[PDB]
Enzyme design. Structure first.
Site, PDB file in Angstrom:
ATOM      1  N   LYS A  60       0.852  -1.148  -0.060  1.00  0.00           N
ATOM      2  CA  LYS A  60       0.134  -0.044  -0.149  1.00  0.00           C
ATOM      3  C   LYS A  60       0.890   1.066   0.011  1.00  0.00           C
ATOM      4  O   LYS A  60       1.748   1.239   0.582  1.00  0.00           O
ATOM      5  CB  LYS A  60      -0.956  -0.089   1.336  1.00  0.00           C
ATOM      6  CG  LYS A  60      -1.985  -1.133   1.429  1.00  0.00           C
ATOM      7  CD  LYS A  60      -2.889  -1.152   0.389  1.00  0.00           C
ATOM      8  CE  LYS A  60      -3.576  -2.630   0.254  1.00  0.00           C
ATOM      9  NZ  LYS A  60      -4.874  -2.751  -0.409  1.00  0.00           N
ATOM     10  N   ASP A  70      -0.476  -0.182  -4.390  1.00  0.00           N
ATOM     11  CA  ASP A  70      -1.874   0.028  -4.409  1.00  0.00           C
ATOM     12  C   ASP A  70      -2.106   1.628  -3.685  1.00  0.00           C
ATOM     13  O   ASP A  70      -1.817   1.489  -2.639  1.00  0.00           O
ATOM     14  CB  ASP A  70      -2.537  -1.184  -3.778  1.00  0.00           C
ATOM     15  CG  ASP A  70      -4.262  -0.905  -3.705  1.00  0.00           C
ATOM     16  OD1 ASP A  70      -4.610   0.117  -3.953  1.00  0.00           O
ATOM     17  OD2 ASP A  70      -4.792  -1.825  -3.107  1.00  0.00           O
ATOM     18  N   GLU A 102      -2.221   0.199  -8.657  1.00  0.00           N
ATOM     19  CA  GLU A 102      -3.420  -0.256  -8.546  1.00  0.00           C
ATOM     20  C   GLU A 102      -4.402   1.299  -7.691  1.00  0.00           C
ATOM     21  O   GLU A 102      -3.877   1.906  -6.977  1.00  0.00           O
ATOM     22  CB  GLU A 102      -3.720  -1.409  -7.437  1.00  0.00           C
ATOM     23  CG  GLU A 102      -5.349  -1.776  -7.199  1.00  0.00           C
ATOM     24  CD  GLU A 102      -5.180  -3.132  -6.294  1.00  0.00           C
ATOM     25  OE1 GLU A 102      -4.230  -3.780  -6.334  1.00  0.00           O
ATOM     26  OE2 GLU A 102      -6.216  -3.172  -5.666  1.00  0.00           O
ATOM     27  N   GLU A 128     -11.675  -3.056  -7.925  1.00  0.00           N
ATOM     28  CA  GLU A 128     -12.371  -3.606  -6.675  1.00  0.00           C
ATOM     29  C   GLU A 128     -13.507  -2.528  -6.136  1.00  0.00           C
ATOM     30  O   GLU A 128     -14.214  -3.303  -5.511  1.00  0.00           O
ATOM     31  CB  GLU A 128     -11.257  -3.480  -5.612  1.00  0.00           C
ATOM     32  CG  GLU A 128     -10.987  -2.069  -4.861  1.00  0.00           C
ATOM     33  CD  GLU A 128      -9.739  -2.139  -3.875  1.00  0.00           C
ATOM     34  OE1 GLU A 128      -8.805  -2.945  -4.456  1.00  0.00           O
ATOM     35  OE2 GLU A 128      -9.946  -2.024  -2.687  1.00  0.00           O
ATOM     36  N   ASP A 136     -14.519  -7.836  -8.274  1.00  0.00           N
ATOM     37  CA  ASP A 136     -14.738  -8.074  -7.138  1.00  0.00           C
ATOM     38  C   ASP A 136     -16.127  -8.879  -7.053  1.00  0.00           C
ATOM     39  O   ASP A 136     -17.044  -8.584  -7.655  1.00  0.00           O
ATOM     40  CB  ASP A 136     -14.850  -6.952  -6.432  1.00  0.00           C
ATOM     41  CG  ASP A 136     -14.962  -7.254  -4.742  1.00  0.00           C
ATOM     42  OD1 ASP A 136     -13.914  -7.671  -3.997  1.00  0.00           O
ATOM     43  OD2 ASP A 136     -16.206  -7.418  -4.329  1.00  0.00           O
ATOM     44  N   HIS A 191      -9.652  -8.895  -7.106  1.00  0.00           N
ATOM     45  CA  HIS A 191      -9.488  -8.317  -5.724  1.00  0.00           C
ATOM     46  C   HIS A 191      -9.950  -9.372  -4.874  1.00  0.00           C
ATOM     47  O   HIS A 191     -10.803 -10.143  -5.082  1.00  0.00           O
ATOM     48  CB  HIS A 191     -10.005  -7.165  -5.649  1.00  0.00           C
ATOM     49  CG  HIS A 191     -10.434  -6.482  -4.396  1.00  0.00           C
ATOM     50  ND1 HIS A 191     -11.402  -6.467  -3.611  1.00  0.00           N
ATOM     51  CD2 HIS A 191      -9.421  -5.864  -3.350  1.00  0.00           C
ATOM     52  CE1 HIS A 191     -11.364  -6.258  -2.436  1.00  0.00           C
ATOM     53  NE2 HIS A 191     -10.201  -5.735  -2.199  1.00  0.00           N
TER      54      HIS A 191
HETATM   55 MG   LIG Z   1      -6.827  -2.578  -3.603  1.00  0.00          MG
END
Ligand SMILES: [Mg+2]
Ligand SMILES: [Mg+2]
Ligand SMILES: [Mg+2]
Ligand SMILES: [Mg+2]
Lengths: 441, 441
Positions: A223, A251, A277, A306, A329, A356
């Site tokens: 992240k 992400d 992402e 997602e 998703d 996801h």
């Molecule tokens: Mg994500």
């Protein structure tokens, strides 16, 4: 068909896990999530003990709003013969998603669509269980005309007609036995998000990396997007632990404006990420395309999906060539029905699908969709991988089975949605044991 | 500033009008709406008797889901000093729309955004009342730096920076006294949707047309899109009653796929419609642009926006040149704050704004936004008009005042959101008098 019974009962419960107190799961946008779900159970009058279980995933607050919307949709599934639903699944899908009054509170987005996904997930679970097959196998064995009869093509016939969908599924018949054998023998390739989270000290992050590497993981997400210096600190640690030959994904969880995403990524490009992402708003199709054109020259692809609310957004992402990796998703889109339409559009556009997962049970559901994708739709693993997170599988009756960082195909009938009743009761919000201890009256 | 008090109480009620039993309001998509609202009332500890009233509009079923989401947001406004909210309105907007957990159930779309609009509408009503000004006048008199401080620019700084917004508002100062005088003397030009609805016999439709023409209406909308022959029957009647010099608008309420919208409109083009409204999905930006390129050669513009969920969708509609008329909605977007950002983007792109209205109180609110647009933002009436529907104004304390088919500027303090308590109580769902008679226990 082994389908029987009239849907006689529906229950929906607010289930919440206190993951914000565990220290994992923080990202740049959602800094304190409590992984939660609206858990649906439907029963028939068949007296066979087979129940349909369904979920939709949330971050805690707002789960009660989803539960409310499941209650608003319940009259559409109650007192219906399951044969009549599965016999015109497109029609049933249209009644849930285009209800003449309820569609105003979406349409096909937000709370009402999350609730629709939870109800439809319970029907797919029930159908697959009555057929004695896991959902991936039910889909693989389905006649192409039967499968397209489950899908609503409204707003996507301009890129994918029913005929186009049939052509992709007919082609997907070729080598389907060989691909199913491959799946049963080695599983679906995964990446881990377990070293990704914000808030970890250097030592903690090095420990998680070392454990993942020891356990056989070779593909890692991280992240980013709240603090550039923190992103460089954590990406440096991961890239030094995993080496240059291993896959790193970033992400940003929608943090950035369009020029800002390009600038921030120009500084993180030294870590050689495979993809970035959700660089911006999940609604900004043109924005994702602007970032993609700027970053593909640095060798970085764009991934999103997602929180992409329905197939109309995915259609435009494909039309605008806005993404290199499309992330379906299982609980954001309109259950199996809408996910099938998005898998078929991604193949039509020759774009790889990288699902996801994580949260509450997303791994357990989405693995069926991507195994089906490999066997019957894309017929490839090239540029494709499924997300995996090590959270809360002990609360599912049929938890995911990981072997050599791969999803082994579920063996049991159903959609793997079924939760352990002891887990549901302890974590029911607000009156379950865990919430009475965390929020005493 | 005259702002004072701590927000001490919030109430939200499910109010529903049985308009489906009246025979008006049917369109090709929503064939049986019950015009409804989540009605919010906030109080302060100021002991001045001034209350903030807010609404969001629904079609009946699902209003209870919106009420649930208002209850989820309530803790953000309760125990807050109004000075602190209005002093950093951007910050308060971000806390409601980007709550670290609640944003997952949107973000900024569907139920959670409708609820956010209802709460924010009650705060704008309260603020305008404490200042002793109608909302349009509060906005007109606001310092440009103060106004831009109320707006969240996330995801739109790539087309409209804070500096760009300031430049439009500074330019809008020029001739603002002359434009406010014009508004007070003649009002904001409107069109009627009262002859538009599906299900009317020939005689009924001729009667409604004759009455509207007699009452001074010269601009008319008609619903289309369920049945081509019925559309030709009703468009023929209206066009013969109103003549060729009067304005006719068509509204398909999202019925069509992209090629289908072009084909259907090629057959209705003989009626010389000014615009075709919502020809397809409110999410399909690229779709609206495809239809616009095909129809602008026939002299037909594209209008959309009433179900457009947030400013990111409007930004892309403007970026893609997908529409000739942009239709803001007072209760779909994030209240006054987000509507201001969309008015400013439409001016930046030189696209006319034609507000959506009707329903429960949308006329009463949206008239403030478009009067403000004329006086301070676009400084023009060219290609601009406000929708009007003759429904339910008797349930508002400050009903719209129409003179010569024009909105006369509201004179009283507030956002005209306040409902008559006798009306709210009789129409409260499920226990108000009207619903106990329609759905007896
Ligand atoms: Mg994500
Ligand atoms: Mg695959
Ligand atoms: Mg309309
Ligand atoms: Mg104007």
């Amino acid at each position: 068909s082994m389908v029987r019974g009239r849907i006689s009962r529906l229950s929906v419960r607010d289930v919440r896990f206190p993951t914000s107190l565990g220290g994992h799961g923080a990202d740049a946008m959602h800094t304190d999530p409590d992984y939660s779900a609206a858990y649906v159970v439907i029963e028939t009058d068949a007296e066979d003990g087979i129940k349909g279980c369904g979920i939709t995933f949330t971050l805690g607050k707002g789960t009660e709003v989803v539960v409310c919307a499941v209650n608003a949709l319940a009259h559409h599934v109650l007192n219906k013969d399951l044969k009549d639903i599965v016999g015109d699944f497109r029609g049933f899908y249209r009644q849930l998603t285009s209800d003449g009054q309820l569609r105003w509170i979406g349409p096909e987005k937000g709370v009402v669509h999350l609730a629709t996904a939870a109800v439809l997930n319970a029907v797919w679970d029930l159908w697959a269980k009555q057929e004695g097959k896991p959902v991936w196998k039910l889909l693989v064995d389905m006649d192409p005309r039967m499968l397209v009869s489950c899908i609503d093509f409204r707003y996507i016939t301009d890129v994918l007609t029913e005929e186009d969908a049939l052509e992709i599924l007919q082609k997907g018949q070729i080598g389907k036995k060989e691909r199913e054998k491959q799946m049963l023998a080695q599983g679906y390739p995964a990446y881990t998000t377990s070293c990704a989270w914000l808030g970890y000290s250097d030592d903690t992050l090095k420990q998680l990396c070392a454990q993942a590497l020891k356990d056989g993981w070779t593909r890692f997400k991280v992240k980013v997007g709240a603090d550039l210096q923190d992103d460089m600190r954590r990406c440096q640690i991961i890239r030094d632990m995993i080496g240059p030959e291993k896959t790193l994904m970033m992400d940003a969880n929608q943090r950035w404006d369009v020029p800002e995403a390009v600038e921030w990524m120009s500084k993180l490009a030294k870590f050689k990420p495979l993809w970035i992402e959700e660089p911006t708003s999940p609604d900004d199709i043109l924005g994702h395309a602007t970032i993609s054109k700027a970053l593909v020259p640095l060798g970085i692809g764009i991934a999103t999906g997602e929180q992409c609310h329905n197939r109309v957004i995915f259609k435009q992402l494909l039309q605008a060539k806005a993404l290199q990796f499309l992330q379906i998703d299982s609980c954001r889109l309109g259950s199996v029905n809408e996910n099938l339409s998005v898998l078929l559009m991604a193949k039509k556009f020759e774009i790889p699908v990288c699902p996801h997962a994580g949260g509450v049970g997303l791994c357990e559901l989405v693995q069926h969709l991507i195994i089906f994708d490999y066997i019957s739709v894309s017929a490839s693993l090239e540029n494709r991988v499924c997300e995996y997170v090590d959270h809360l599988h002990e609360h599912f009756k049929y938890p995911v089975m990981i072997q050599r960082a791969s999803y082994m195909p579920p063996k049991d009938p159903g959609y793997s949605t079924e939760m352990k009743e002891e887990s549901v009761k302890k974590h029911q919000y607000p009156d379950g044991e865990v919430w009475k201890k965390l929020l005493p009256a």
